[PDB]
Amino acid sequence: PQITLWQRPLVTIKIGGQLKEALLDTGADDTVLEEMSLPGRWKPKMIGGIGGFIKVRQYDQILIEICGHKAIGTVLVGPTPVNIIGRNLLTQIGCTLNF
Amino acid sequence: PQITLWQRPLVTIKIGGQLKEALLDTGADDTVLEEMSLPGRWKPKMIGGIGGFIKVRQYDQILIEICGHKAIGTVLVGPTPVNIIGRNLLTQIGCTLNF
Ligand SMILES: COC(=O)N[C@H](C(=O)NN(Cc1ccc(Br)cc1)C(=O)CC[C@@](O)(Cc1ccccc1)C(=O)N[C@H]1c2ccccc2C[C@H]1O)C(C)(C)C
């Protein structure tokens, strides 16, 4: 589909059997979601944006569905103000910027 | 043009007669540039990102060219990690997300 930017590009995602709302974020290197449980091993990571850095848990090879499009990648979990779908997963669903 | 996201979507912008590198950021509601000089008066604005909120200076009706496309709008100036082109200007150049 084509998503305009008149409003925040929020979409429905399916992860860990749960339905959530997330932001298609081209300014984000990684994907980070609010506190939730995920399977497998994880390691700590610090990510930074405007305001500074926050500590998150890094889980790899996680299955995620964005608007019905399946993709697998690293998903970060921590105190993020909003769910963010970053470039690491946006590439997988073939998302591009156009103008 | 069409921009993929395998690498950060960095483009050249022109403001105040100078070229700068900036990130097309769909996750950003506003445009915020690293410390620089802009004309006119400014107003205070608090913007929140991953690490919390920061105080920035808000200048309005500023001429800024993005990838050759001319825009005129609000530009914030403050301690940002990188120059960020947000949705307020991405809408002016007709940018959309597609997949
Ligand atoms: C490794 O560095 C990253 O890529 N870090 C990401 C990040 O923070 N990216 N930042 C900016 C940034 C920092 C460093 C670099 Br090299 C590039 C880019 C954003 O602007 C987008 C997030 C976001 O859209 C998230 C968000 C938080 C709260 C509500 C909505 C969305 C952001 O902080 N957006 C805000 C913003 C940025 C600039 C101007 C105005 C605003 C208001 C929000 O939209 C992340 C992995 C931690 C998510």
Curated annotation (Swiss-Prot), chains A, B:
Residues 1-5, 49-55, 88-99 are annotated as: Dimerization of protease. The active site is at D25 (for protease activity). It comes from the Viruses. Coiled coil: none annotated. Transmembrane segments: none annotated. Residues 20-89 form the Peptidase A2 domain. Aspartyl protease that mediates proteolytic cleavages of Gag and Gag-Pol polyproteins during or shortly after the release of the virion from the plasma membrane. Cleavages take place as an ordered, step-wise cascade to yield mature proteins. This process is called maturation. Displays maximal activity during the budding process just prior to particle release from the cell. Also cleaves Nef and Vif, probably concomitantly with viral structural proteins on maturation of virus particles. Hydrolyzes host EIF4GI and PABP1 in order to shut off the capped cellular mRNA translation. Homodimer, whose active site consists of two apposed aspartic acid residues. This is Protease. It comes from Human immunodeficiency virus type 1 group M subtype B (isolate BH10) (HIV-1). The chain holds residues 501 to 599 of 1447 of the full protein.
